[PDB]
């Protein structure tokens, strides 16, 4: 999926979309391409345990430093464990093995921290009407955190102004959450034709570099 996104992104940025004679950004909206999932909270404890996160459906997950993943569903009980090689197992907080006891308490520790401290991003957006993804990989730069979900989506949160990109290669689309927390979803092909403001074009050039890095990290 990332090769599809990199090309979608490569075409748009080739358009010079902020250079249109008359930018018509709103003409590039497609409200039915809104994503189903995005990362609504995250905690980087990677010096000790790994990266904990919340998805917009109130499920939570951890990508441990040993490259394993544990997800808790929003029912608060069902777990999915994903090993380094991608092998997937279902367990529950009720009925689980003892070998995961430490990782489950780390998840609960992350879960508790996020509910006590953190604002849920996009809480006013209803997701589109889907298999629950996990965090495949992530990295931080000095200006943003980059989050790659198992369903193909790439999210980039920008630290300075709290703006966020959600890129979906299945829709050839991007969602931009701006400084005022207003969200707009765009078909990237339409952003090529109609153009966009300099701020968004700046973010999309950055996004291309980030997707190159994700692709090269495979």
């Amino acid at each position: 999926h990332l090769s599809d996104m990199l090309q979608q992104l490569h075409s748009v940025n080739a358009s010079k979309p902020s250079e249109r004679g008359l930018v018509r950004q709103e003409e590039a909206e497609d409200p039915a391409c809104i994503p189903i999932f995005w990362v609504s909270k995250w905690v980087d404890y990677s010096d000790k345990y790994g990266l904990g996160y919340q998805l917009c459906d109130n499920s939570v997950g951890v990508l441990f430093n040993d490259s394993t993943r544990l997800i808790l569903y929003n029912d608060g009980d069902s777990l999915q464990y994903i090993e380094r090689d991608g092998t997937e197992s279902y367990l529950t907080v009720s009925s689980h093995p003892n070998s995961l006891m430490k990782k489950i308490t780390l998840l609960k520790y992350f879960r508790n921290y996020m509910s006590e401290h953190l604002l849920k991003a996009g809480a006013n957006i209803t997701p589109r009407e889907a298999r629950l993804p996990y965090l495949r990989t992530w990295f931080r730069t000095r200006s943003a955190i980059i989050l790659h979900l198992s369903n193909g989506s790439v999210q980039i949160n920008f630290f300075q102004d709290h703006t966020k990109l959600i890129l979906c290669p299945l829709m050839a689309a991007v969602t931009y959450i701006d400084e005022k927390r207003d969200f707009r979803t765009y078909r990237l092909s339409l952003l090529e034709e109609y153009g966009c403001c300099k701020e968004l074009a700046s973010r999309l050039r950055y996004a291309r570099t980030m997707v190159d890095k994700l692709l090269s990290s495979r």
Binding site: K41, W42, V43, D44, Y45, Y113, H117, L118, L119, A121, I145, N157, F159, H162
Partner: peptide, 7 residues
Amino acid sequence: PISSTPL
């Protein structure tokens, strides 16, 4: 930061 936007 080491976590997302706090309340």
